[PDB]
């Protein structure tokens, strides 16, 4: 036929069985059968989200026609997926595309058993536009309105709005049949019906756990894609991996690994070494976080809730306010958590909230609204979380934001949602949201409290917690703090912890001297002198960073430039010895290199 | 082919002739592409990375894996074609002539049956004969991409996937995003070692193993608008080109002087006259700053800490508050420090904070947020 | 080719089709001083719409056919390239750039062409507003090397909005400030245009009709500018003679009564100022002659160059000021009540004088 040159006989494909089985969709195919059985507008357009099975409904109608499960006023009518692109292809002269389209419409009147399926019906606007020739839809619009042409369309809900609703005469001539995104229970039945086609292709076996896994894990962990497709994507790609094993089962673990490789979200069943890494999670965060055990335990419990599968699936993995003194490791734990979960601190989404000074810098988080500049960019926060859904999002210096930027982030905490300016909801349900505040210490740090009171050393931490938690309640709306999973007021760094900070900060200096063919030994008397002179009980470890800079580095940097300590072994012994005790501010370090 | 050679280039034939660079590492990413290509419904991976993380290299590494037979036996000896959509549009002055050429390509896929298309810059598929609500190259492929009748690797950046592929949300459905991550420094050194013979033969230099380390480490440190497996290669090639214009070896100092010319950050091996400039640095600042010895020492300790390589890489070089009475050399030491480091007072970035007494002039520092004048 | 987007001003000069310019020959010398440069020989005539900027290069084109130019400007042909005409009729991709390259091809071919791009602010934003190739990015290579001599002409606002904001474009063009004339400069402009009028309109124009066209257009017209709105009054004066021949000063006062709308045309009406103020105010006539008295000094006699035309304290009150505005230049609606009872605070002081930028009440 000439109709075979510009289309695909879709009931001939259903008779040959090269259309996939369409399980469910009884109400949607029956609805198409109603609209095709009309007399005025015989034209259903299947509108739905991309991937919900709009093309599947028609190729399930094609199977219903072949199997005789079709009305008698629709019996033995052959569906033709009209390729509009093949109608255009070759139409270099005036009135070729029109002649081809009128010739296609002749073979629908003469045969009388044709139903066109114009997939991507929005492409019917155009397709004959050469500005010396008329439109493709303008040829069809007389025959669509009077029932003279039975045409199924299929368009996404976006492209129906963008291109069909902006031609209200064409929109009028089609009946919008909603093809909804199926439920998870409907998607499992789709995957059980498609089970044969993916087992036969991949030479695998797909256990019923893997259908339940593919529909549940795709509905939970994917938000840019739709169910009767993102669950098929997990079945198809996991079945492809088991074929690549032999270059036979696909089960629950095989689906979760594909979902893990795709989203980035670890949901897969665990090795023994990765399970025991999560039990040593506190002990491995304490390789970088000296002290701060309340907060190291708190972020470890949030990660272990997620990897046990006990996370509330409508909420983030953890919402934290790291509060307390300045320099005690609030940002540094957010770094150490991101190094634990990923291997670097560049995987930390660090939103520095001091850059947010009025309400309208919240447009940096979720992007500009429609009609305004920078609408093409979806915001700094909503993109970085849409690329990496499993993330640690640090809102550093959260009290320095304007108070109306928390209100953007309220439903990030409770729902795991932040709809950007473009309108895409971003999944925050797998992020660890860490808020960092200095509230209640950006002053109280200074020792002594207005008035009389007992104790100090552990009752100034209870004074710290009461001061911080009251400054949080003063600064934040109570519905923000209601949605935080754990508020951890941090400890001031004790004298014994500043000793262990010296081991941690000389290791940065010694790690740089490895690149200079040097080594840096730091004697244990020199660890104590840095630890005294660096100990402020109310700042902690950032004054120690200054003392290691002033006394080790600034003296060692000239010794390198003098070439007096080139590729050797800088020992750094103390000399006045500061008697090892009492003040040691008459003591001095000496740097000598050997070997 | 005959019709597919006009509209693309055979990438596996380029791998047989060894005209592709060695793609070392990226095993988990090439395997992931082969897992997607071995599907049946949508066997269309799209490589979603950042510019220069090696997205085109993953497919060029795939084309080398096809030639070597390190590919699955459902993907064995499939000729890969980088589809040049500019070559498809070129010509096509008449209606359907673009749609002819794409349907001739797609018919050539089905007759041969051993073709993987590689639409590099897959965002260019969105609109190639007309707009999105008309017959473009995307709307012709979308029936065949959705049913596994066409194996097509795409590769866009993260921005081009947002701005163009997600704005055609039906086409995004047809592709399976394989995220190509930016490599680590340890992985980039392995990339640079594998690419050594290509650049030490084009430049006729000898790039030492330390220069591979000093390219990947220094590009990850000091370059912040580019990505690792390209910005470390930029240091390797331009230092190899530095050496060829001296006509035998690309050392650490050859890499670091190329980064010094490109960033402006002096990280190179200090000459002995420049080393003694930094030990006399206090005395050079006292030619402009009378007195203020504790202040001249402190900014000289910060610059000597930077040029000795003892700077914290997560901190600025120095972070000073010059406090004190008016007219004793607070602004003048900042000007003298910029004269020492650059020979210019105009090299000093004076952010005069008396203009910032408003709460809202913070936007003069970091710009306006999206939706505002001063966002451009 | 180049005749399809503008006329040859040099060929119009030697055919006598151009109005002679009297004065602004220091402006013409400044434009020759730009055009005789080597590297960026592109003047932009900065003015405001009607001061005579086409008239500057109309006088430059007359200076070429008179041979009063440098040797780098002799036998040059000026073309008023309308770049809006290049945009017009251009619906397609590449259709715009084709008829700009046809223009630039005749620059290379002839070599003696000086383009006069009137409305040079249009040069930014002819294809894509610098997002892609516009007419600016096509010209900017040749403008920077002196291989394309181009006289721009734009308003000082439009030079700042479009040409100064493109910092690459502002160095290619050299601002020639064409100021608005004085009234005594406008009269000697219209002396040389008397020959152009009397040949066309079949009129004879007396001496003070120019004086009553230049002083009077400065007095009542502020939207338009001097060496154009005064040409307009002598134009519309013969347009009453086409209804009918010597024009008067009343002939110009007639045609400004058409234009602005006021028929009042000061020593006579200033003396019996009181009677035209009694026509809306009867009763309290002592204050009527009091506010008549001081204004008989300010608008008749001696006046400081920096003072308002009388300042009063009223302690009908506002009905007299409305009748005072009606005598003032001829309109009832010139009275603006500020309602100072609607302001009591210090931050509301910026709600009637203008806001500092950034803040509420900027308009």
């Amino acid at each position: 036929l000439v109709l075979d040159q510009f289309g695909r006989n879709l009931t001939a494909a259903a008779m040959e069985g090269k259309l996939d089985p369409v399980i469910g969709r009884e109400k949607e195919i029956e609805r198409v059968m109603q609209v095709l059985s009309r007399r005025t507008k015989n034209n259903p357009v299947l509108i739905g989200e991309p991937g919900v099975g709009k093309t599947a409904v028609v190729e399930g109608l094609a199977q219903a026609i072949v199997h005789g499960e079709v009305p008698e006023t629709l019996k033995d009518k052959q569906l033709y997926t009209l390729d509009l692109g093949s109608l255009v292809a070759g139409s270099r002269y005036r009135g070729d595309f029109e002649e081809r389209l009128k010739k296609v419409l002749k073979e629908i009147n003469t045969r009388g058993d044709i139903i066109l399926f114009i997939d991507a019906l929005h492409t019917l606007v155009g397709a004959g536009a050469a500005e010396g020739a008329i439109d493709a839809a303008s040829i069809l619009k007389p025959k669509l309105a009077r029932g003279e042409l039975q045409t199924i369309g299929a368009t996404t809900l976006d492209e129906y709005r963008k291109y069909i609703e902006k031609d209200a005469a064409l929109e009028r001539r089609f009946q919008p049949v909603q093809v909804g995104e199926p439920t998870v229970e409907h998607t499992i039945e789709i995957l059980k019906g498609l089970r044969d086609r993916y087992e036969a292709h991949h030479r695998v076996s797909i256990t019923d756990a893997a259908m339940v896994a593919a529909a549940t894990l795709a509905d939970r962990y994917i938000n840019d894609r739709f169910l009767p497709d993102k669950a098929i994507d997990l079945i198809d790609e996991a079945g492809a991996r088991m074929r690549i094993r032999r270059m036979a089962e696909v089960d629950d673990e095989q689906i979760a690994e594909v979902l893990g490789n795709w989203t980035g979200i670890p949901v897969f069943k665990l090795t023994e070494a990765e399970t025991t890494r999560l039990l040593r999670m506190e002990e491995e965060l304490h390789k970088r976080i000296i002290g701060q055990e309340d907060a190291v335990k708190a972020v470890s419990k949030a990660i272990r809730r997620t990897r046990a599968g006990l996370k509330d699936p409508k909420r983030p993995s953890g919402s934290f306010i790291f509060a307390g003194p300045s320099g005690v490791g609030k940002t540094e734990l957010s770094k150490a958590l991101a190094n634990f979960l990923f291997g670097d601190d560049d995987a930390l989404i660090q939103i520095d909230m001091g850059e947010f000074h009025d309400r309208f810098t919240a447009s940096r988080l979720f992007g500009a609204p429609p009609g305004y500049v920078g609408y093409e960019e979806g915001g700094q926060l909503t993109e970085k979380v849409r690329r990496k859904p499993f993330s640690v999002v640090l809102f550093d210096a959260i009290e320095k934001a304007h108070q109306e930027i928390y209100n953007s982030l309220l439903q990030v905490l409770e729902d795991g949602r932040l709809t950007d300016g473009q309108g895409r909801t971003v999944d925050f349900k797998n992020t660890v949201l860490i808020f960092t505040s200095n509230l209640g210490t950006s002053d109280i740090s200074k020792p002594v409290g207005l008035g009389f009171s007992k104790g100090g050393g552990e009752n100034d931490y209870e004074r710290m917690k009461q001061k911080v938690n009251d400054e949080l309640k003063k600064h934040f709306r109570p519905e923000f703090l209601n949605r935080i999973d754990d508020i951890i007021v941090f400890h001031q760094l004790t004298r014994e912890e500043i000793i262990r900070m010296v081991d941690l900060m000389i290791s940065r200096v010694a790690g740089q001297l490895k690149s200079k063919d040097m080594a840096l030994v730091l004697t244990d008397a020199a660890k104590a002198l840095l630890a005294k002179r660096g100990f402020d009980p109310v700042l902690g470890a950032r004054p120690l960073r200054r003392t290691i800079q002033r006394e080790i580095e600034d003296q060692l940097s000239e010794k390198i430039l003098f070439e007096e300590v080139g590729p050797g072994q800088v020992v750094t012994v103390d000399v006045d010895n500061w008697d090892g005790e009492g003040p040691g501010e008459d003591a001095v370090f000496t740097f000598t290199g050997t070997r | 082919s005959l019709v597919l050679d006009q509209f693309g280039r055979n990438l596996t034939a380029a791998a047989m002739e060894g005209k592709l660079d060695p793609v070392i590492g990226r095993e988990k990413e090439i395997e992931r592409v082969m897992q997607v290509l071995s599907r049946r419904t949508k066997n269309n991976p799209v490589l979603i990375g950042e510019p220069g993380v090696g997205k085109t290299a993953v497919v060029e590494g795939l084309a080398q894996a096809i030639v070597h037979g390190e590919v699955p036996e459902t993907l064995k000896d499939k000729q890969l074609y980088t589809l040049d959509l500019g070559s498809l549009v070129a010509g096509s002055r008449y209606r359907g002539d673009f749609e002819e050429r794409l349907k001739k390509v797609l018919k050539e896929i089905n007759t041969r049956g051993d073709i993987i298309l590689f639409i590099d810059a897959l965002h260019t598929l969105v609109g190639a004969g007309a707009a999105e609500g008309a017959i473009d190259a995307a709307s012709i492929l979308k029936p065949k991409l959705a049913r596994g009748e066409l194996q097509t690797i795409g590769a866009t950046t993260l921005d081009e996937y947002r701005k163009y592929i997600e704005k055609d949300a039906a086409l995004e459905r047809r592709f399976q995003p394989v995220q190509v991550g930016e490599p680590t420094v340890e992985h980039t050194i392995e990339i640079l070692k594998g690419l050594r013979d290509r650049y030490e033969a084009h430049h006729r230099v000898s790039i030492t193993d330390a220069a591979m380390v000093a390219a990947a480490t220094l590009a990850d440190r000091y370059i912040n608008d580019r990505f690792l497996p390209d910005k470390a290669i930029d240091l390797i090639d331009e230092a190899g080109a530095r050496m060829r214009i001296r006509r035998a070896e690309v050392d650490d100092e050859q890499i670091a002087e190329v980064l010094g010319n490109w960033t402006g950050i002096p990280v190179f091996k200090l000459t002995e006259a420049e080393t003694t400039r930094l030990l006399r640095m206090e005395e050079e600042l006292h030619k402009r700053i009378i007195g203020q010895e504790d202040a001249v020492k402190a900014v000289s300790k910060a610059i000597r800490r930077t040029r000795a390589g003892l700077k914290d890489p997560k901190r600025p070089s120095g972070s000073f508050i010059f406090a004190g009475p008016s007219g004793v050399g607070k602004t003048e030491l900042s000007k003298a420090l910029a004269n020492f480091l650059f020979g210019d007072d105009d090299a000093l970035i004076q952010i005069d904070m008396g203009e910032f007494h408003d709460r809202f002039t913070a936007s003069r520092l970091f710009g306006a947020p999206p939706g505002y004048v001063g966002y451009e | 080719v180049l005749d399809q987007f503008g006329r040859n001003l040099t060929a119009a000069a030697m055919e006598g089709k151009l109005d002679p310019v009297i004065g602004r020959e220091k402006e013409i010398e400044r434009v020759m001083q730009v055009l005789s440069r080597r590297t960026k020989n592109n003047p932009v005539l900065i003015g405001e719409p009607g001061v005579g900027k086409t008239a500057v290069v109309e006088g430059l084109a007359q200076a070429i056919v008179h041979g009063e130019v440098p040797e780098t400007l002799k036998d040059k042909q000026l073309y008023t390239l309308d770049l809006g005409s290049l945009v017009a009729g251009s619906r397609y991709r590449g259709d715009f750039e084709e008829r700009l390259k046809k223009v630039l091809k005749e620059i290379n071919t002839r070599g003696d062409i000086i383009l006069f791009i009137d409305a040079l602010h249009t040069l930014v934003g002819a294809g894509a507003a610098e997002g892609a190739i516009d007419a600016a990015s096509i010209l900017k290579p040749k403008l920077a090397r002196g291989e394309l001599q181009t006289i721009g002409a734009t308003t000082l606002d439009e030079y700042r909005k479009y040409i100064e904001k493109d910092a690459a474009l502002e160095r290619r063009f050299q601002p020639v400030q064409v100021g608005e004339p004085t009234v005594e400069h406008t009269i000697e402009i219209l002396k040389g245009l008397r020959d152009r009028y009397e040949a066309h309109h079949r009129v004879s124009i007396t001496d003070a009709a120019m004086v009553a066209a230049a002083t009077l257009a400065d007095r009542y017209i502020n939207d338009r500018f001097l060496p154009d709105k005064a040409i307009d009054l002598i134009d519309e004066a013969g347009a009453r003679m086409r209804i009918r021949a010597e024009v008067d000063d009343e002939q110009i006062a007639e045609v400004l009564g058409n234009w602005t709308g006021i028929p009042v045309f000061e020593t006579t009406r200033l003396l019996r100022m009181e009677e035209e103020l009694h026509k809306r105010i009867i009763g309290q006539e002592d204050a009527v002659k009091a506010v008549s008295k001081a204004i008989r000094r300010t608008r008749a006699g001696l006046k400081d160059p920096k003072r308002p035309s009388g300042s009063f304290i009223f302690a009908g009150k506002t009905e007299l000021s409305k009748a005072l505005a009606n005598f003032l230049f001829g309109d009832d609606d010139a009275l603006i009540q500020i309602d100072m009872g609607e302001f009591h605070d210090r931050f509301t002081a910026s709600r009637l004088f203008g806001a500092p930028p950034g803040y509420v009440g900027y308009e």
Binding site: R94, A130, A133, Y375 | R93, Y372, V373 | -
Partner: peptide
Amino acid sequence: KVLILACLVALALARELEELNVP
């Protein structure tokens, strides 16, 4: 104290288009 709202327009995108010959 008050925003400005740049409010980016969209453009018409001056178009290439295929045409139709006839012999």
